[PDB]
Write a protein that binds this ligand. Structure first.
Ligand SMILES: [Ca+2]
Length: 102
């Protein structure tokens, strides 16, 4: 898993910023309770099911937790125009330090 060749739409700086965010809200996985805390600190808490739905959207290996690759997939979906307006994932991407739409 080389995120640098898989996610060519993000600069190395963007990917490293995404990694800094990932490591912070962290074994290398962000589970539901970790995602809950992250949305709380960001100022936008989500419901239990809202968090589960955020994970489900990018959980490509179906273990109900987010690897770094799947975290990057959130930003890929955001930058591809695939997230629903004001969805939990849209809100995470917006409130992160990371601008992907320009
Ligand atoms: Ca997963």
């Amino acid at each position: 898993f080389n995120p640098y060749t898989e996610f060519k739409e993000f600069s190395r700086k963007q990917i490293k910023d995404m990694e800094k965010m990932f490591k912070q809200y962290d074994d290398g996985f962000i589970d539901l309770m970790a995602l809950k805390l992250m949305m709380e600190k960001l100022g936008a808490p989500q419901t239990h099911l809202g968090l589960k739905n955020m994970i489900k959207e990018v959980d490509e290996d179906f273990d109900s937790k987010l690897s770094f690759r799947e975290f990057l997939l959130i930003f890929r979906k955001a930058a591809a125009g695939e997230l629903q307006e004001d969805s939990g994932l849209c809100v995470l991407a917006r409130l992160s330090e990371i601008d992907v739409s320009s």
